[PDB]
A paper describes a structure:
Sterile alpha motif and HD-domain containing protein 1 (SAMHD1) is a dNTP triphosphohydrolase that catalyses the breakdown of dNTPs to constituent 2′-deoxynucleoside and triphosphate, and is therefore an important regulator of cellular nucleotide homeostasis in mammalian cells. Nucleotide binding at these sites promote tetramer-assembly and regulate SAMHD1 through combined binding of G-based (AL1) and 2’-deoxynucleoside (AL2) triphosphates.
BD Dimer-2 retains the tense state with substrate-loaded active sites, all allosteric sites are occupied. d The depletion phase, States-IV and -V predominate. In State-III, the active sites of the tense side of the tetramer also maintain the same nucleotide configuration as in State-I and State-II. However, the active sites on the relaxed side are now completely empty with no substrate or products bound. Further examination of the nucleotide content reveals that on the tense side, in both State-II and State-III tetramers, the active sites contain substrate dNTPs, and the allosteric sites are loaded with GTP-dNTP pairs. In State-III the further movement of the C-terminal lobes away from the lobe-linkers results in loss of all remaining interactions constituting a released conformation.
Numbering used by the authors:
A (entry chain B): 115 to 276, 284 to 578
B (entry chain D): 114 to 276, 284 to 578
C (entry chain C): 114 to 275, 284 to 506, 515 to 530, 546 to 578
D (entry chain A): 114 to 276, 284 to 506, 515 to 530, 546 to 578
């Protein structure tokens, strides 16, 4: 057994199978993908990658399954179950692209709007390619795993079911599907891991305490299926969890300067495409947008490409190059304004492309010498929620009492406190102007105020 | 001749000779034997800190804030006298605390002497006067440039309210100096900053607020013909987070059920042990626990020691009280029965609690069980949660400013921040305990409690 | 059932019902009012912790270490009875401190009753016996699978020392006797808790990493008997331990002002004795120095005594009380001199009253007009004691491969008398060859 | 306007607009892509920080110390231009680092061009001159009250050494300003405090030094006729603790068994990859990895990207180097053979680095050697292992004052019998030459 030293956790022990899986090009590719993407250009201490995040998530999944097993010997938890859960926690982010959430957040929807792609599909495909190429099946068989069923069990833990829709484990082990990714209420070890790590690196103090949560967790057989349950004295702690998630999102992840830097990087990638060449299986050639359909080509697509565009000399990639150079001089797109949040005038994705035009067509009352077209405006729509899209995540949790540990109850928002939030979803709209001269900024402000007053925000 | 003292929360804090002179007095050293969280030490074993270090840290933070404000804007004309007066006020702002701190003025004085209104800030002012008079600090203050006649009143008005522009210590143009140690318009000051960090450090909990950023982004504005401190308009969410952290601390630690019941038992022991404890004051007169607040010589000798004085006693007269304390040693506490759902903070006035238990004894449950319980077998506790105004939003009383127009102060409404902010800012709670340990009486008390709750439609 | 307690240093500590039963007794709760550093609270404001949390943490650490050792080597045959016994021994290892902790048995008893030899470990054993017999704990232990007769002896031997002398356990469990306390090399959980808590409270960065130590801890046979071993690579690991120990002892435990305040407190206690009465077993009245002969009276001896002297009004206590007042104005005794750490004369706690008399009797070579008696001199004796361990190599997991300081203080603080007292000290040192 | 940046180590840092103008340049921004440790990132997962934050923190600490010294001793005649100059010097002290930091100038250049002596401080000075002359900073400096020539010389002399008063930036009166950023006499400077704090925070190791106490108690006192930084006589334990922490870091992190091996593998891959990688410089001329240090416009584009340029290549000419990198991706690392002779009785010089594995093969063991070795299978590591002169001052007298070599050898051939033979060759190499 190896021993690795994590600054966040203590010393992590690794099963030999995990060491075998980690020493592959597919997993080692994560050393060159940043956790927070463009936010590194606002918080200089955020230089961590996904390698340590995956290590920590696997460690925490193993710890949680062990703690659950050693308190209730009637659940019949074996070592192969722990190994499968740890492997699933280890290989849950294999499909991330350059700059992490930017790519599948901004680049793929724009370059190829006819495909529905998420990084979990990429993670599953990467896992399959890794297992097939590196020949891990005999090693798995050596350590007491059954590839035929355990591979599907691991796959379903990452994406979901691909009555009882799962095929990896029976209903008796239903509580094993709510550890790495919870589809019901969103309480899992991923949140704990990146809360701790991001708070450590960014320079902000963390508020949640997951060890206390592990101390009070149980399996209380909710609605004909075994599920993980909490004590009824920890509702406020879960509300605090979600509050700190929201605070992190509004302080760091949705910083407007970081968002505009990400937008500029996406523009550079869009302009530089059709000229970058990537080699895949069979000697075929791919692009940045089309590399997601070949994993041998996807394996060679990391944050390196950024610099490949900055240091290039080809006159064909000149335009994109210029944009990146601006990022190195801090000649960024300027910020004009935003609109107050609203929970009932939602804007769908399909309308995003039409937003800039609406701002360009607004006619301010006072005549202005400067005239701005529809290509001088960037409109960004931000969605803030608790993860359930206007629903209350805490209303899908099951609680038990000290007197009757094996009986599940439900707690309503009115039985906790009157100081809890009245809503659980909102949006924001931000406007940026590409032109940097003062007159253009004044004009953009006039158009923005006219457009906002017209639509009554 | 400036001293250096090391604090585990802050770094190494430097002390002026005048502060060193003031600290080396019995009236200030008395704070070494008064616990901060009181009865909460019996639930959180790490909470053994006292008020001495709290006062030191508050004075240090007040000095730092004044120094930063003077650094940013030279036109404010802040002299050394102002800084030293603010530091002294921060030092002597909690001199009037009694045994187990809040518990005393929270529970004991209102019961033993219900005909008087007493707050520990009045005690702090009286103790400060007694300290200055006894220790002869006036010439020492004069030798360092202070004017006792005006500066003493300035410090007094800093500690308490003003008792048309009502203050007298300074002129109006320095009015921003009155809202550093204690703020009355809202609840932003350095006391909260100090004890948030201290309590989180000692209770094994993580703090969420960062006051250094707030110091980085503070200014002085001329709002309503008054000079007052402003934060920049991008810090609204941080202030909401500050108040959320305050509420979280209150609900997790300060209002713990077992801590509250232990405090109630200690108050009962003190109430029963009175009339048999004599305290010597000025002139050789003898005082009591509830009467010592009328004489500072007797109040100086009243600390947590009295607790143990009742535990180790041998007089037959103090038997009853002694028994109660012994029950705390074996952990035979009053048993939790029930709690009521939250409502607004104004539903039961102060002059109603005495009637609450009797009502629970007047309920007749449908089952109509045996083991009748009298009105003396029930304890009813009323808890009030709020953001500091008990009905209002403190953020509505904060002046902001913008980068483009730093000298112009504005106001930000709740609807302009977010839609996930709390709907209300006040809350009330009721808890019921039973003074019995056998299971049958607990089940009976549960039936009475449910009948009462379903009878007043809470 | 299991009870969870939050610790600022460690995480959430789980307590067995037997430990909860032991904790909820007056004898254990007495530890809430005895401070750890003692007189160091008046130099470092943040050091206000007591021995209650220290005992809790030591028990937690001992249990964790035993559990890890038993889990990583199932051939040692460690049962849950041994884990419970070790946890109990760690829990009740410091029941014998008096007021202000190490000062009392270090400074008060020798100066009060020179003919009596007493350590706080004997007090801990006696108080453990009193706690067990006075609260009816034996049936509770029998209810959880323990054998009281042998287990009580096992715990006592874990607290105090005894061709193998121990009788609590057989010869093949010799590694269980060096967890709570180790007199050979000094690797034990008591010191780990000391280091962690003191560094956290005082504000001094710690350097030892005990989790790493527990990670690579094995039991390998040495000298035909089992001992706890350490991997070869962990040589810089168990050097931060000694560096931190030296740093703490130099920076905090031997600070001049703290020692002076301890000296003043002991002087006030000595003057106060013969007037404070404490009720013991049967109603008999004891004294501060004599209370250690009865545990009924010893249970009520805490830091409270301090304030009892300070707030008194009886005219018989005007002297001791006066001394304490000088602490409250920072009118402390005055440092004069220091002398040999060589140890030529390793002064033991049999003649401490004579030392100031010896200093006074010394006649300086140069005549000094100011005369000083033996009532205005104090002698503070600071008795401070790599001891090497048995390592083990990777390829062979089953194979293995004191000073003293004396300071002198002058009660008189006028410069003229201090000048002469400085001259007396050098003559005394020359006479005693220090 | 002042600009605030958040550092997890130091809190919130204010930057003067001149520093903000210096920072927002490509020559400073290339530091975002060079790692603090290099190979150590492959043993400690949490050591992924770069030199950008290190430079920021060093500048912050230097400014703080200068301000404190000037404030507590007003007779030292410390102006504001001096504070700005010290901050700039601290900001641009590591501007000349190459890929993977100390591995480059310490290991790659000697093995590639032994005829050239080069340190990264010369690179830092050259890059500072390039940045200033290329980004038009001189008028901006003149705008804020600085004289370009004297201040430029002062900063350069603060970075490099003297370049009986050998300095020219400041007179003999300001002799204490030259030991804040870099101090080669004893080794007490902010550059090392930042190293200690950041490395302990990231790796997980905990340090014991407390630099705030040192700054509080530090003063400036006359020693040997010159003004010098002096510490109170009670700081002896703290200084010993500082040295102990430095020793612990060096023996536990910077000299780990596997990090050095990975560094040697990376250097071998780079050496094989040379002669085929082209870098464009001034005037369109193409340079090499070894010769890029002769031009700064080409040196600007030399970062840790080269690694990924070789690993993700398709040119057959780079196959050999590529293969080596692939081994690092499978943990098929070179093995450990032997280690010998601390204290450097010879103190090897850089010029001999590319001759050591020739004497190892030269040695002829008397034992039976059926398997033969050659001067390719051996890699030589020359890992270096490196109380002081402190002028203390007593409380009662405020104004009165009162390193070894190491060698290791690895075998590229990882066969059991080949490893056995290599373990013999080394013994005769060390015994013949008196190691
Ligand atoms: N194997 C491996 N170890 C890593 C990795 N990242 C960090 N480490 C740590 O670095 C240490 C070095 O291990 P190895 O590279 O296998 O070196 P080694 O211990 O001499 O190899 P063995 O002799 O086979 O045990 C490990 O113990 C890990 O704790 C990684 O990606 N793979
Ligand atoms: N004066 C004083 N110092 C305290 C107190 N609490 C902690 N300390 C610290 O303890 C240290 C001891 O200082 P002193 O008691 O005055 O002894 P000293 O260093 O010899 O000072 P002098 O006798 O005046 O020269 C101080 O430097 C403080 O930092 C306190 O209540 N009063
Ligand atoms: N029993 C006990 N708990 C303590 C003590 N000190 C701190 N605590 C903590 O305070 C909490 C209060 O527990 P109890 O005093 O037993 O109150 P309770 O939970 O209502 O009692 P039960 O209903 O029997 O569980 C415990 O869970 C401990 O974690 C102590 O000395 N004894
Ligand atoms: N200028 C600059 N800021 C950085 C850098 N790295 C992190 N930051 C921080 O990121 C924040 C945002 O960068 P800015 O360029 O100032 O964006 P901005 O505040 O909208 O620009 P201004 O309106 O001119 O103030 C800054 O306040 C810095 O604290 C950097 O390399 N350069
Ligand atoms: N003193 C230390 N404190 C904390 N982490 C450490 C320390 N020494 C090493 N580490 C890191 C290095 C690795 O990330 C992990 C363990 O490595 P380490 O024990 O040195 O393994 P190794 O590969 O050198 O030895 P081996 O395989 O021979 O046991 O912890
Ligand atoms: N090494 C240390 N690290 C941190 N805090 C310390 C250290 N030594 C002492 N302290 C604490 C003790 C006091 O709380 C505060 C200042 O004490 P210290 O500087 O030792 O004064 P002192 O009384 O010994 O000397 P003096 O008054 O003669 O300068 O710092
Ligand atoms: N939210 C919290 N975070 C951290 N520590 C807490 C929190 N609430 C309580 N603690 C502390 C108090 C005690 O020291 C320890 C356990 O207390 P707690 O969980 O409240 O038990 P309890 O005795 O009140 O409940 P019960 O008997 O119902 O289980 O943890
Ligand atoms: N809430 C926060 N807590 C801690 N650090 C923060 C927070 N918000 C931002 N930071 C970081 C981001 C930068 O590293 C640094 C300053 O950022 P910030 O205050 O947002 O400046 P800015 O450039 O966006 O605003 P402006 O130009 O309007 O003053 O602090
Ligand atoms: Fe994740
Ligand atoms: Fe306060
Ligand atoms: Fe102990
Ligand atoms: Fe540096
Ligand atoms: Mg290994
Ligand atoms: Mg994911
Ligand atoms: Mg998810
Ligand atoms: Mg001192
Ligand atoms: Mg107050
Ligand atoms: Mg207040
Ligand atoms: Mg309980
Ligand atoms: Mg002991
Ligand atoms: Mg800005
Ligand atoms: Mg350097």
């Amino acid at each position: 057994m190896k021993v690795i030293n994590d600054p966040i956790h203590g010393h992590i022990e690794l099963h030999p199978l995990l060491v075998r899986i980690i020493d592959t090009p597919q997993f080692q590719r994560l050393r060159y993908i940043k956790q927070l993407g463009g936010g590194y250009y606002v918080f200089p201490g955020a230089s961590h990658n996904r390698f340590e995040h995956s290590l920590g998530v696997g460690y925490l999944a193993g710890c949680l399954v062990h703690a659950l097993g050693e308190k209730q010997p009637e659940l019949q938890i074996s070592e192969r179950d722990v190994l499968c859960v740890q492997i699933a926690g280890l290989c849950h982010d294999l499909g991330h692209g350059p700059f992490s959430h930017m790519f599948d957040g901004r680049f793929i929807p724009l370059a190829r709007p006819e495909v529905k792609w998420t990084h979990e599909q990429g993670s599953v495909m990467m896992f399959e390619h890794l297992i097939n190429s590196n020949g891990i099946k005999p090693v798995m068989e050596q350590y007491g795993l059954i590839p035929e069923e355990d591979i599907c069990f691991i796959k379903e833990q990452i994406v979901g079911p691909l009555l009882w829709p799962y095929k990896g484990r029976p209903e008796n082990k239903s509580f094993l599907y709510e550890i790495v990714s919870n589809k019901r209420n969103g309480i899992d070890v991923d949140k704990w891991d990146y809360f701790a790590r991001d708070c450590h690196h960014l320079g902000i103090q963390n508020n949640f305490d997951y060890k206390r949560f592990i101390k009070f967790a149980r399996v209380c057989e909710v609605d004909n299926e075994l599920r993980i349950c909490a004590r009824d004295k920890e509702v406020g702690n879960l509300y605090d969890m979600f509050h700190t998630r929201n605070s992190l999102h509004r302080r760091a992840y949705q910083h407007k300067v970081g968002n505009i830097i990400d937008t500029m990087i996406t523009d550079a990638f869009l302009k530089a495409d059709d000229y970058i060449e990537i080699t895949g299986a069979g000697g075929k050639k791919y692009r940045i947008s089309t590399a997601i359909d070949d994993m041998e080509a996807y394996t060679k697509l990391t944050d390196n490409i950024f610099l490949e565009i900055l240091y290039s000399t080809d006159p064909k990639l000149k335009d994109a190059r210029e944009i990146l150079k601006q990022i190195e001089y801090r000649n960024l797109f300027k910020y004009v304004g935003e609109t107050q949040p609203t929970g009932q005038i939602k804007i769908k994705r399909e309308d995003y492309e039409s937003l800039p035009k609406e701002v360009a067509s607004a006619k301010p009352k006072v005549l202005l010498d400067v005239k701005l077209k529809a290509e001088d405006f960037i409109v960004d729509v931000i969605n803030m929620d608790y993860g359930m899209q206007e629903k209350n995540p805490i209303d899908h949790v099951s609680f038990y009492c000290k007197t009757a540990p094996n009986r599940a109850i439900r707690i309503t928002k009115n039985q906790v406190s009157q100081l809890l939030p009245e809503k659980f979803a909102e949006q924001l709209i931000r406007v940026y102007c590409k032109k940097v001269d003062r007159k253009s900024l004044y004009a953009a402000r006039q158009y923005f105020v006219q457009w906002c007053a017209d639509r009554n925000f």
